[PDB]
CSV table of C-alpha atoms in Angstrom, one decimal:
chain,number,residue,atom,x,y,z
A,1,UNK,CA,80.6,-36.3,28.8
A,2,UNK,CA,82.0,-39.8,28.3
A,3,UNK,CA,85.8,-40.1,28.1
A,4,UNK,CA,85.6,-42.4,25.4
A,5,UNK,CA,83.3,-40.0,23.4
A,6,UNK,CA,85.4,-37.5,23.6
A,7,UNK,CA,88.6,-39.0,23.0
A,8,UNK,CA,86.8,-40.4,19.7
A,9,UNK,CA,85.8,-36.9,19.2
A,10,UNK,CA,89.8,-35.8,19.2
A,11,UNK,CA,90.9,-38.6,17.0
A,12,UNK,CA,88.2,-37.8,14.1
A,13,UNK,CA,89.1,-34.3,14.4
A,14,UNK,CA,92.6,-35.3,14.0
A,15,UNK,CA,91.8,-37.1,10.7
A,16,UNK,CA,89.5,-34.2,9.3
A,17,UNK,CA,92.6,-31.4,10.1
A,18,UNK,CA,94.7,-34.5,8.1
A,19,UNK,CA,92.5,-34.6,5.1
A,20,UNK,CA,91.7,-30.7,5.4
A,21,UNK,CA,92.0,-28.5,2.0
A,22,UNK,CA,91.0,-25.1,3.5
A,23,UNK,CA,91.7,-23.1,6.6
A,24,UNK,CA,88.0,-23.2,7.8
A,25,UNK,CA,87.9,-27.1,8.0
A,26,UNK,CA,91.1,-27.2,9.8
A,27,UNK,CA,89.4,-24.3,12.3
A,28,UNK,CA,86.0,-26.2,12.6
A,29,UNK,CA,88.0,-29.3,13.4
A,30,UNK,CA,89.7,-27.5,16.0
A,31,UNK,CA,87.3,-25.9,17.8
A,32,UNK,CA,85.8,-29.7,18.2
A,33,UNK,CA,88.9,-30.9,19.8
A,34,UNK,CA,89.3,-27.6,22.4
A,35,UNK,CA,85.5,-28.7,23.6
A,36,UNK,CA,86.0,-32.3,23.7
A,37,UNK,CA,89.4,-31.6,25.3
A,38,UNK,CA,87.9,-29.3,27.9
A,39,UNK,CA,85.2,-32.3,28.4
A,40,UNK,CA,87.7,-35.0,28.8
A,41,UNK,CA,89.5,-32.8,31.4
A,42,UNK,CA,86.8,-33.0,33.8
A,43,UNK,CA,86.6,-36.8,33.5
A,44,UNK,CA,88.4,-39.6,35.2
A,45,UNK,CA,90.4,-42.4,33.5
A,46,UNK,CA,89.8,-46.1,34.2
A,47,UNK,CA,93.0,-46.3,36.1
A,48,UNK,CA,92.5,-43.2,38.3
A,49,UNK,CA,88.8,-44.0,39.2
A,50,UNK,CA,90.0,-45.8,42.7
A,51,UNK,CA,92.3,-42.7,42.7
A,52,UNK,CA,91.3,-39.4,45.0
A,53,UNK,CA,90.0,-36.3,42.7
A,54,UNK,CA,92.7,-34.7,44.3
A,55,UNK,CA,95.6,-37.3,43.5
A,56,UNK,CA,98.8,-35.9,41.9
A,57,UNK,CA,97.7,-38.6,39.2
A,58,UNK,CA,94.8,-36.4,38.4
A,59,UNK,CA,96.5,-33.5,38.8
A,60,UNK,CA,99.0,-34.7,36.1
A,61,UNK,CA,95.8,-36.2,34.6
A,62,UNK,CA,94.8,-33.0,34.1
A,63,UNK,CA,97.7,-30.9,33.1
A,64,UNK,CA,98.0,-33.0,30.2
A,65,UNK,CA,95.0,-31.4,28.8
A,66,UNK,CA,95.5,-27.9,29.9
A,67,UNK,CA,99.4,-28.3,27.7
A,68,UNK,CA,96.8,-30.0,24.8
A,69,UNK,CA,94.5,-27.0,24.9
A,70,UNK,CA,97.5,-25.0,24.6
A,71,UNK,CA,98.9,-26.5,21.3
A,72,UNK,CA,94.9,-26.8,20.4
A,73,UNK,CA,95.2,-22.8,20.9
A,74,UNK,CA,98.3,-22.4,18.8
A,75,UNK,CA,96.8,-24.1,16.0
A,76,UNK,CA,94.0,-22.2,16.1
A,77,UNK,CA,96.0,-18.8,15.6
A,78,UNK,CA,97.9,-20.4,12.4
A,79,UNK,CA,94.6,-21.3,11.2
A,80,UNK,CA,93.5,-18.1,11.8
A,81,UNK,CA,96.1,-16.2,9.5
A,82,UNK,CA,95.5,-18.6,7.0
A,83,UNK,CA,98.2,-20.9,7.3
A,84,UNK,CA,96.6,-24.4,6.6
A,85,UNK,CA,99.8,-26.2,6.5
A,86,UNK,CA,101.7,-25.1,9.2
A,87,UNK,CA,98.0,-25.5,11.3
A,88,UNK,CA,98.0,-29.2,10.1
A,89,UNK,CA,101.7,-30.0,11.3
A,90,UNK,CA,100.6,-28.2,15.0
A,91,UNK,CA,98.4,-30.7,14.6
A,92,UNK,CA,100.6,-33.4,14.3
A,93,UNK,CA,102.4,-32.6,17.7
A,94,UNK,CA,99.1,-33.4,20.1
A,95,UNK,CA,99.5,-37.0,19.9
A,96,UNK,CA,103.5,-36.8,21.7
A,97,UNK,CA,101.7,-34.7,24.5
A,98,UNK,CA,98.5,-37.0,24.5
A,99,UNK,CA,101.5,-40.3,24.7
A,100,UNK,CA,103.1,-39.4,27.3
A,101,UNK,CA,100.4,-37.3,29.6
A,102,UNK,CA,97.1,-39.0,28.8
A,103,UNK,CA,97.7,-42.5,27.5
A,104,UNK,CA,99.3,-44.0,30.4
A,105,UNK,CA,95.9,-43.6,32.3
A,106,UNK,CA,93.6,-45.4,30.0
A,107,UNK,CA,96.1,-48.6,29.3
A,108,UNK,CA,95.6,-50.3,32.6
A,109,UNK,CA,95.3,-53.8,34.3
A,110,UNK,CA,91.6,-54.7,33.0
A,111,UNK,CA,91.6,-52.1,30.0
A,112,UNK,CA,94.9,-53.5,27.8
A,113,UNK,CA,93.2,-57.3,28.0
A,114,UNK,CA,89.6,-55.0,26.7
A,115,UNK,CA,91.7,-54.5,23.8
A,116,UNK,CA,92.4,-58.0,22.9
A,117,UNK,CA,88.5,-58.9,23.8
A,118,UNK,CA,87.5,-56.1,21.2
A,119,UNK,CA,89.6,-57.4,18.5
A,120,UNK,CA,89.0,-61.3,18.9
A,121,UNK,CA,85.2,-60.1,18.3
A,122,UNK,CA,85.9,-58.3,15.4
A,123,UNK,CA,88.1,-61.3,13.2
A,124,UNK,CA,85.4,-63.1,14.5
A,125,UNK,CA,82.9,-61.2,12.9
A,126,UNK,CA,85.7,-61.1,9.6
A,127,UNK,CA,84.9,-65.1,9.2
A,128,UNK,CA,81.5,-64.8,10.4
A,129,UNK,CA,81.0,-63.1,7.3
A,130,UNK,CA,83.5,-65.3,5.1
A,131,UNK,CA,81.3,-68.2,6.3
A,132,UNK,CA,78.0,-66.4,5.5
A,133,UNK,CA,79.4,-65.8,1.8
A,134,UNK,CA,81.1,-69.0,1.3
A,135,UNK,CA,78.2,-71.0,1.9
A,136,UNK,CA,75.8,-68.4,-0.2
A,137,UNK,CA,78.4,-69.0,-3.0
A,138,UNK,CA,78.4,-72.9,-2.8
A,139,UNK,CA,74.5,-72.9,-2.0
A,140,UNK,CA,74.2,-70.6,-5.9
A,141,UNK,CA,77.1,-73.0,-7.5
A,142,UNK,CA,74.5,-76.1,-6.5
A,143,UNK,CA,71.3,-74.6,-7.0
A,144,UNK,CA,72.8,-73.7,-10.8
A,145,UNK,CA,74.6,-76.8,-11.3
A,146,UNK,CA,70.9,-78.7,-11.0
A,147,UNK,CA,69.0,-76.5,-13.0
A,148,UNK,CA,71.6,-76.5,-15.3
A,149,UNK,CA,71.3,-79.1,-17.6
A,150,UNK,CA,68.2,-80.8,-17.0
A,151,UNK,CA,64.3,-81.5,-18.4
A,152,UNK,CA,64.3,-78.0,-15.9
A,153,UNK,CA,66.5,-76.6,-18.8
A,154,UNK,CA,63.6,-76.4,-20.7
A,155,UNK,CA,62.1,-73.5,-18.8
A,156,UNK,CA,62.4,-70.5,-19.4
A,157,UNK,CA,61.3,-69.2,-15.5
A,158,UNK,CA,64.6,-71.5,-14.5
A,159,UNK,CA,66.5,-68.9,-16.6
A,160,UNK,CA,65.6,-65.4,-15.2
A,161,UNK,CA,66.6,-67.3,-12.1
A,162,UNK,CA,70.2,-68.8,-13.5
A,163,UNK,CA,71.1,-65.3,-13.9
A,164,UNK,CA,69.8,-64.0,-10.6
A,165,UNK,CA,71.9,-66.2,-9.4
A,166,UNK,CA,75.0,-65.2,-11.4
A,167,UNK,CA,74.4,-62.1,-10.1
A,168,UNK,CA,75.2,-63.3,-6.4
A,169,UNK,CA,77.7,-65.7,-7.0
A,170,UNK,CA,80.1,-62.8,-9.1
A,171,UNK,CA,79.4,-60.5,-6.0
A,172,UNK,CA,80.0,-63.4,-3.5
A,173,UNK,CA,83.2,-64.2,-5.4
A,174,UNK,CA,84.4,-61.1,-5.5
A,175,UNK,CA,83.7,-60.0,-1.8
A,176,UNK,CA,86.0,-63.0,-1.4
A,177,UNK,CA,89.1,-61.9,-3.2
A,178,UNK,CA,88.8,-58.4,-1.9
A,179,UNK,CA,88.8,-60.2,1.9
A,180,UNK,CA,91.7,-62.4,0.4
A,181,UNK,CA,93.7,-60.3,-0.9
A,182,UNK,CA,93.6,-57.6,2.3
A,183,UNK,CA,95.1,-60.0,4.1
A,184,UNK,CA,98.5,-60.9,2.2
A,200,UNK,CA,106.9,-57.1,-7.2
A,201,UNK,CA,103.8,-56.7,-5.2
A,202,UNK,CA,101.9,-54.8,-7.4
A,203,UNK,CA,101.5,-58.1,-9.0
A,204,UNK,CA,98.5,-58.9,-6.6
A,205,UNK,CA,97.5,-54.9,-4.9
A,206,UNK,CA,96.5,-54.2,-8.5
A,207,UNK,CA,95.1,-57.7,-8.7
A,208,UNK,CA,91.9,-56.9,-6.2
A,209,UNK,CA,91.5,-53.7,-7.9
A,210,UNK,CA,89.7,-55.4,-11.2
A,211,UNK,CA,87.9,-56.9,-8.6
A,212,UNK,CA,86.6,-54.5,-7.0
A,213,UNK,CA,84.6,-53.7,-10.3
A,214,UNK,CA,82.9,-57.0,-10.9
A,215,UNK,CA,81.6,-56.4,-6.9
A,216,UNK,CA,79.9,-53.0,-7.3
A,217,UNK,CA,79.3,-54.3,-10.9
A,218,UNK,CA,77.2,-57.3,-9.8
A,219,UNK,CA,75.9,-55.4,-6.6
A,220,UNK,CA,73.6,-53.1,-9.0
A,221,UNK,CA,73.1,-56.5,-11.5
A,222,UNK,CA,71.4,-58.4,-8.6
A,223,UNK,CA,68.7,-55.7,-8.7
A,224,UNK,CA,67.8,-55.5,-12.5
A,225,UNK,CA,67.2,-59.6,-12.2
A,226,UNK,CA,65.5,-58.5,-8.9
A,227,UNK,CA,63.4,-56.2,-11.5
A,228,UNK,CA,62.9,-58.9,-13.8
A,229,UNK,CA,61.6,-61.6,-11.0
A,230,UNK,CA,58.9,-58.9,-10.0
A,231,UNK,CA,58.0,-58.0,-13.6
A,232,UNK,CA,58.0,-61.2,-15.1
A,233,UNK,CA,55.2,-62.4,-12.3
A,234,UNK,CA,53.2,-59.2,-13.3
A,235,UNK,CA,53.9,-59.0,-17.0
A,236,UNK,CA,54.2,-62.8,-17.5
A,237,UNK,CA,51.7,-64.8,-14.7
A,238,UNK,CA,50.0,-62.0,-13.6
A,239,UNK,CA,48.4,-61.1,-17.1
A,240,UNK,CA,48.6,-64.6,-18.4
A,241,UNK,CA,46.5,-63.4,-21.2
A,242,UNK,CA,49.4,-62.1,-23.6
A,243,UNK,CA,51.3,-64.4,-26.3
A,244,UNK,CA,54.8,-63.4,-25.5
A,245,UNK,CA,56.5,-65.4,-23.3
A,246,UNK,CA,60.1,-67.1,-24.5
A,247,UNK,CA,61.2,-64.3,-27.4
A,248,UNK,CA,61.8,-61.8,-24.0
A,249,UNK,CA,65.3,-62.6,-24.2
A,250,UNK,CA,65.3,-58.7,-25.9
A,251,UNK,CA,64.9,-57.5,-22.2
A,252,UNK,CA,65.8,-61.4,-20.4
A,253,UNK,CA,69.4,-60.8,-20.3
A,254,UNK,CA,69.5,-57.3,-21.5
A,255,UNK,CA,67.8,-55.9,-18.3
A,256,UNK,CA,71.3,-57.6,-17.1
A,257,UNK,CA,72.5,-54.3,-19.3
A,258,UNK,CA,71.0,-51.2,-17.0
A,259,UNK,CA,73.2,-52.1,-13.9
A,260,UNK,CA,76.2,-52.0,-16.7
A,261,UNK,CA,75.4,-48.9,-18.5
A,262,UNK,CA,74.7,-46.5,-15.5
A,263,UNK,CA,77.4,-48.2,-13.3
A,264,UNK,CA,80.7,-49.1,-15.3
A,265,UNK,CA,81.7,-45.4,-16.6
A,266,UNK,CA,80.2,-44.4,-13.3
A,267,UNK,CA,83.1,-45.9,-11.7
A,268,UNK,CA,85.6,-47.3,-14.2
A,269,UNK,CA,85.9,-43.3,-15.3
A,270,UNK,CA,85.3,-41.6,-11.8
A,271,UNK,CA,88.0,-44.3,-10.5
A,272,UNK,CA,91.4,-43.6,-12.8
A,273,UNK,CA,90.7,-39.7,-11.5
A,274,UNK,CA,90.7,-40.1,-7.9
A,275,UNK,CA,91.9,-44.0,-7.1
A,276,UNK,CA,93.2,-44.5,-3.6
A,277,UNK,CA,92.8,-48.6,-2.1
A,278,UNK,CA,91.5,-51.6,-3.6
A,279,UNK,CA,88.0,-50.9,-1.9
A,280,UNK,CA,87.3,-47.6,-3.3
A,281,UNK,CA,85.8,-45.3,0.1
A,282,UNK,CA,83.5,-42.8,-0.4
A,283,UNK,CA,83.9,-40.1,-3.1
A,284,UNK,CA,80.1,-38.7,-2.7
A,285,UNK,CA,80.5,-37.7,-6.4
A,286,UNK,CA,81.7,-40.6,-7.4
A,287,UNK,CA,79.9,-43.7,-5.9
A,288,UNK,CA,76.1,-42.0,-5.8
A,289,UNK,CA,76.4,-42.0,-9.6
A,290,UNK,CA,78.1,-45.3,-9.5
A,291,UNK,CA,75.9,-47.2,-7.9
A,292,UNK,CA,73.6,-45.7,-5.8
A,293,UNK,CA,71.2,-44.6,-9.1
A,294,UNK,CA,70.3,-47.9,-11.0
A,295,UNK,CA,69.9,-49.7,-7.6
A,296,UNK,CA,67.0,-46.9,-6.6
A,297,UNK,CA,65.7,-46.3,-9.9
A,298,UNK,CA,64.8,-50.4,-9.4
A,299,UNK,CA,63.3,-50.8,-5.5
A,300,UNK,CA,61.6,-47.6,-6.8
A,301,UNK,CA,59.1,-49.0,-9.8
A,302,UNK,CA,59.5,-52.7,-8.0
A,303,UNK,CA,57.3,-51.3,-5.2
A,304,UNK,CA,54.1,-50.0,-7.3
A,305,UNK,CA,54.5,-53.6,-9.0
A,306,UNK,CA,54.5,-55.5,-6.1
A,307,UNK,CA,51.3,-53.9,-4.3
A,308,UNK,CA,49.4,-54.6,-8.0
A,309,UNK,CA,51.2,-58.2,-7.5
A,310,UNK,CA,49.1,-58.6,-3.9
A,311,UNK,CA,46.3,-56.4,-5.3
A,312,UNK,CA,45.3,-58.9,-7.8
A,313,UNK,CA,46.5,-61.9,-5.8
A,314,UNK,CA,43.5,-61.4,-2.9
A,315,UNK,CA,41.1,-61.3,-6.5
A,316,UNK,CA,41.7,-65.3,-7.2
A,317,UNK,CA,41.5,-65.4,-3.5
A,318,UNK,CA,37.3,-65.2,-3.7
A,319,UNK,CA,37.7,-66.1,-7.8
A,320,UNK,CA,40.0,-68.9,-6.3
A,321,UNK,CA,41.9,-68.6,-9.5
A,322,UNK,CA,45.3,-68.6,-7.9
A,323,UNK,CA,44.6,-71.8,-5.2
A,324,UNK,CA,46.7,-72.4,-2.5
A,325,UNK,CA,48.6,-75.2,-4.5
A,326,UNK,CA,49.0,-73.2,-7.8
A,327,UNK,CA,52.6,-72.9,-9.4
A,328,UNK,CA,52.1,-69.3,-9.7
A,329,UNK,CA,50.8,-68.9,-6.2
A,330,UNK,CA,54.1,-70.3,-5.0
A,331,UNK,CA,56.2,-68.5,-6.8
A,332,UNK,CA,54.0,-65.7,-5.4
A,333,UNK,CA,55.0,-66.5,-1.9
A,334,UNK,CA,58.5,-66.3,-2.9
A,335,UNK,CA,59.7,-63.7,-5.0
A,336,UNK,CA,57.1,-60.8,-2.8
A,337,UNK,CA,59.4,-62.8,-0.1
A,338,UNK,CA,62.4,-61.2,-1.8
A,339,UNK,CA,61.2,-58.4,-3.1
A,340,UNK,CA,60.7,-56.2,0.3
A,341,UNK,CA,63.3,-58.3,2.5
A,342,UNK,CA,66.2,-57.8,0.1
A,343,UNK,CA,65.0,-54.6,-1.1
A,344,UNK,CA,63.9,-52.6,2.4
A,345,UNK,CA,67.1,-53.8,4.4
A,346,UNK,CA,69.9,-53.1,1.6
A,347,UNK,CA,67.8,-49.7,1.1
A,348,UNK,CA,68.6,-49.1,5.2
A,349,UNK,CA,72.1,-49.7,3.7
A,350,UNK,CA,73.1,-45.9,1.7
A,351,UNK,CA,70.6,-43.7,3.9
A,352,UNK,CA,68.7,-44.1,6.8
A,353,UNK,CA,71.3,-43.8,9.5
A,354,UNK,CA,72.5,-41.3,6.9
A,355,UNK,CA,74.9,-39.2,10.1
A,356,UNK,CA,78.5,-39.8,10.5
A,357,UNK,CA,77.9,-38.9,14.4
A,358,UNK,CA,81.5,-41.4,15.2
A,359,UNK,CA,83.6,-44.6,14.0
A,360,UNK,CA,82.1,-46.8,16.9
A,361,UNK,CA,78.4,-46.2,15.8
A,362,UNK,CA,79.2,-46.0,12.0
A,363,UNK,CA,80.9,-49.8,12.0
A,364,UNK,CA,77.8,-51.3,13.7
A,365,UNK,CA,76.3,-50.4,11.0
A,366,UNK,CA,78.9,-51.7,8.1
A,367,UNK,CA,79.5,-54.9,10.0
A,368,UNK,CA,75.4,-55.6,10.5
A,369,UNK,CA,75.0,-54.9,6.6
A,370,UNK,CA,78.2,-57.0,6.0
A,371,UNK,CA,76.2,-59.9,8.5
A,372,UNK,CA,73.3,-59.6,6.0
A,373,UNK,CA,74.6,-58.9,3.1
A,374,UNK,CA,76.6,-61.7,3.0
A,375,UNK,CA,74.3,-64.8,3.4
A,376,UNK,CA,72.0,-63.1,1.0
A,377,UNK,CA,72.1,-65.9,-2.1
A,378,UNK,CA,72.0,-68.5,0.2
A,379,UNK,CA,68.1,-67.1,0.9
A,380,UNK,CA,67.5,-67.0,-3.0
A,381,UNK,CA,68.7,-70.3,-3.6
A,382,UNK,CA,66.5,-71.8,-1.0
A,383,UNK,CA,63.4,-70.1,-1.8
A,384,UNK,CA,63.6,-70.2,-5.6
A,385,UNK,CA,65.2,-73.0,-6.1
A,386,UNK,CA,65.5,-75.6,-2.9
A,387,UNK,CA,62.2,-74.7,-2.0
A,388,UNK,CA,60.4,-75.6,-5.3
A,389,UNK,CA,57.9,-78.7,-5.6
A,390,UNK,CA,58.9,-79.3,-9.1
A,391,UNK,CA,62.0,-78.3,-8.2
A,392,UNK,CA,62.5,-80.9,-5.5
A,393,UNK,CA,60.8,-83.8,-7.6
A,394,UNK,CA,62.7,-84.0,-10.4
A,395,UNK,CA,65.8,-84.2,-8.2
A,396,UNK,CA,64.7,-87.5,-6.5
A,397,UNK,CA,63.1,-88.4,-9.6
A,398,UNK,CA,66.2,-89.0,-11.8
A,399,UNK,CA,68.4,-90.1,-8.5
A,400,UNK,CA,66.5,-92.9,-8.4
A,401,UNK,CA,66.2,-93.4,-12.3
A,402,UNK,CA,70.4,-92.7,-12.0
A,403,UNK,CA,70.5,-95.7,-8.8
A,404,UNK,CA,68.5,-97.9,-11.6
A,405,UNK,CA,70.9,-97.1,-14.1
A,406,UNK,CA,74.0,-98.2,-11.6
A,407,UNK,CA,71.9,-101.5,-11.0
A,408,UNK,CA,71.1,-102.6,-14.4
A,409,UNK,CA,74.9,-101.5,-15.2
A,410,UNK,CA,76.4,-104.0,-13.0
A,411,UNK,CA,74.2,-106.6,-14.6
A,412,UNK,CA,75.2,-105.8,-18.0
A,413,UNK,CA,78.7,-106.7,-17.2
């Protein structure tokens, strides 16, 4: 109904005739363009709307799509015999009629400064992000720099965590040298984002095994807390760190050297559900049956008031099943759940609101496991002041 709708209808069509292997595709896609042509017909273009039905603007209006159902029809009878590529270079040929018949009523007054509105809104939304991922970065580069080397680095909790957050910071890094690098013999640096790429999808699985780990090693570790192991997990500590490796890196490292196009790889189907998409469900999977055994025996010390409301383990508690549906749920919206293509316009609402998310998503984790931690917090002030003391009795030394 909507000329946009339609107009977006022609243009995807255009690409799938573009991209087309096979007769049938390039027929399909056709026969989508002749209906949304016929639809646009009967619509009225932003500059034509103060303009009579009648007007020999919307007669010419018109005309343009009656001479673009034409070459639609042409096309359709090469497809018809067969002949893909001639039917793909008819193809071509729509947008000169389109040009010079259509496009001059859409490009008006108030519609070309529309343009410029729309894509102020989207660089916007290009730093919005670059913020959002900067800050997560230096918020994970502080939150390890304390933890890191410390009467903390002692723990071995402050370790499954020192990794969770490696597991951010390479993907937050890495989202910001494929952003870099996009906007810039030459080779020298397009090849340069490429090895990047792999350390992204590489540590977009990895911050789900240490997402595996934290919801484990609440069960396995504090929610037991009847079992003698404890420290000598490093067998499965950072070798969990080895599952979003194993069924990732061949995955895509293989699958990419046979059908490589840009720096960020688009989707291959084939390619990218075996990449990724298994080891990241294979862990919000078996991270869910933990979690409601996690709450299960939780309410338990509720009555047994094991767990108190100022227990180290209850606070935890209230912080990694804070992370564990949150992160989980809302970058498992991300692959499949508004699984149509249905159009461009509704598919990048949907990339740039995971992009919005996605990116200040280790800023969260290093507040809540780290910033938000009594011990956490004490220590801190505890050796700035013992640090101020040392400056003091330093000066009076000398």
């Amino acid at each position: 109904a909507d000329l946009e709708d339609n107009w977006e209808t022609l243009n995807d069509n255009l690409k799938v005739i573009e991209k087309a292997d096979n007769a049938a595709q390039v027929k399909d896609a056709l026969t989508k363009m002749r209906a949304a042509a016929l639809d646009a017909q009967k619509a009225t273009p932003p500059k034509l709307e103060d303009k009579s039905p009648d007007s020999p603007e919307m007669k010419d209006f018109r005309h343009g799509f009656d001479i673009l159902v034409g070459q639609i029809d042409d096309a359709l009878k090469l497809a018809n015999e067969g002949k893909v590529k001639e039917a793909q270079a008819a193809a071509e040929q729509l947008k000169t009629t389109r040009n010079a018949y259509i496009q001059k009523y859409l490009m008006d007054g108030e519609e070309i400064e529309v343009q410029k509105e729309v894509a102020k809104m989207y660089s916007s939304f290009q730093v919005m992000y670059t913020v959002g991922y900067s800050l997560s970065l230096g918020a994970l580069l502080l939150a390890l720099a304390i933890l890191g080397g410390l009467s903390k680095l002692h723990c071995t909790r402050n370790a499954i965590h020192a990794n969770l957050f490696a597991s951010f910071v390479l993907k937050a890094s890495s989202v910001l040298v494929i952003d870099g690098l996009l906007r810039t013999l030459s080779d020298g640096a397009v090849a340069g984002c490429r090895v990047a790429a792999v350390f992204m999808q590489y540590g977009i699985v990895a911050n789900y095994c240490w997402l595996l780990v934290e919801g484990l090693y609440l069960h396995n570790l504090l929610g037991l807390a009847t079992l003698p192991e404890r420290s000598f997990f490093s067998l499965y500590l950072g070798i969990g760190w080895g599952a979003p490796m194993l069924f990732v890196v061949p995955w895509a490292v293989v699958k990419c050297l046979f059908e490589n196009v840009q720096c960020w790889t688009s989707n291959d189907n084939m390619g990218f559900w075996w990449i990724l998409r298994f080891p990241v469900f294979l862990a919000i999977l078996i991270n869910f049956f933990i979690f409601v055994r996690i709450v299960q025996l939780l309410v338990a010390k509720l009555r047994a008031r094991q767990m108190h409301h100022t227990d180290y383990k209850f606070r935890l508690a209230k912080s990694t099943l804070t992370l564990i549906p949150l992160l989980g749920v809302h970058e498992v919206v991300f692959a499949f759940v508004t699984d149509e293509h249905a159009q461009g316009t509704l598919r990048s609402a949907k990339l740039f609101f995971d992009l919005f998310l996605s990116s200040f998503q280790g800023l969260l984790v290093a507040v809540l496991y780290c910033f938000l931690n009594k011990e956490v917090q004490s220590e801190l002030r505890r050796r700035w002041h013992r640090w101020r003391l040392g400056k003091v009795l330093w000066e009076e030394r000398n």
